[PDB]
């Protein structure tokens, strides 16, 4: 077949971008077979599907005595766009370089005989987080929500600071944060990032982009990306978790429910005993209602329209760790 030239060409450009990012000093990627991955996925459509997005579909699968999380890419939606293929190889190589953390989804390799490199990861047990919580047939407690918060926070700080040249991926949603057996929040699909060059912390992103609702409208109206373009949208990645209300919220009429506007008006109207995802309210609410108040005031502080009032990712992760002190 033409699987061999698939493998040769995409391995060529994969190695080129691999060494261009990190000097050819990779992490031990292993290779899988087409037969192995097709017997894992059972020809790509079943209940083994978990999550949809624009480019990629997150499946379950099973190689010999070992289940896995699998990600393919859309063949039809990518191949006519040079910026999209330059994007998707940045995705796979930056995730492959990103395996050196225990809060990111560890990469385990990729198969290359396809139009695009479908790739395996570490098997998280529970499925993809939806826009509220778990997706398998069941609700999840409160302390695990706080753990999800702090681990999302320090993972994004790693993305912000861990290098000479810093990278920004423009969208943190609860549709991405996968979740294991031992209830850790392994973020994944570092897949809309740009690497802005050395020293300067402000560059003109020529495409404003990424998951409407979490846009930070100052960036949307000024068309350049900053440090703070993630520290906004992490806030309404936290608010979504702690109220359980999706971003495109409707009440019987034309979805006109701005989440920030509702919580900001309810801050001085309902006085904070209304924002706590009410089906959770069989919680004991002993002192953790105060830490609920602390994280909602952190979220509304980190999302206002004057960016220099916003803390950085390091500050929000540090005090998000600090509000563990109810123990």
């Amino acid at each position: 077949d033409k699987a061999k030239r698939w493998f040769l060409d995409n391995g060529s450009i994969f190695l080129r971008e691999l060494v261009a990012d990190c000097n050819g000093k990779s992490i031990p990627i292993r290779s899988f077979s087409p037969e192995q991955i097709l017997k894992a996925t059972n020809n790509f459509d079943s209940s083994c599907f978990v999550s949809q997005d624009v480019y990629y579909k997150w499946y379950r699968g099973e190689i010999e005595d070992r289940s896995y999380m699998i990600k393919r890419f859309s063949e039809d939606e990518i191949t006519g766009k040079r910026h999209r293929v330059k994007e998707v190889y940045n995705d796979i190589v930056l995730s492959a370089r990103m395996s050196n953390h225990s809060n990111f989804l560890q990469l385990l390799g990729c198969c290359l005989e396809f139009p695009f490199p479908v790739l395996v990861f570490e098997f998280a047990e529970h499925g993809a987080m939806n826009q509220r919580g778990g997706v398998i047939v069941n609700l999840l407690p409160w302390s695990v929500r706080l753990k999800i918060g702090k681990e999302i926070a320090n993972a994004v700080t790693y993305l912000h600071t861990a290098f000479p040249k810093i990278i920004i991926h423009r969208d943190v949603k609860p549709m991405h944060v996968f979740l294991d057996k031992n209830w850790t929040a392994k973020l994944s699909d570092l897949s809309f990032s740009i690497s802005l060059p050395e020293g300067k912390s402000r560059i003109e992103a020529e495409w404003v982009l990424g998951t409407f609702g979490y846009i930070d409208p100052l960036y949307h109206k000024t068309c350049f990306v900053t440090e703070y373009t993630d520290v906004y949208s992490f806030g309404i990645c936290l608010l979504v978790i702690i109220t359980g209300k999706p971003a495109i919220m409707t009440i019987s009429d034309g979805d006109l429910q701005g989440i920030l506007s509702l919580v900001r008006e309810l801050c001085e109207n309902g006085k904070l005993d209304e924002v706590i995802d009410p089906r959770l309210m069989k919680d004991i609410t002993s002192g953790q209602r105060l830490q609920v108040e602390a994280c909602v005031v952190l979220a509304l502080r980190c999302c206002k329209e004057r960016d220099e009032d916003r803390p950085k990712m390091i500050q929000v992760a540090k005090e998000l760790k600090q509000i563990e002190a109810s123990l």
Binding site: V54, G213, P217, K221, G258, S261
Partner: peptide, 22 residues
Amino acid sequence: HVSTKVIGTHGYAAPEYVATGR
């Protein structure tokens, strides 16, 4: 749903349009 924002690339757009899109 388009992930790349085209409608109102600058301050012409609206704070409610950033939320709902309607």
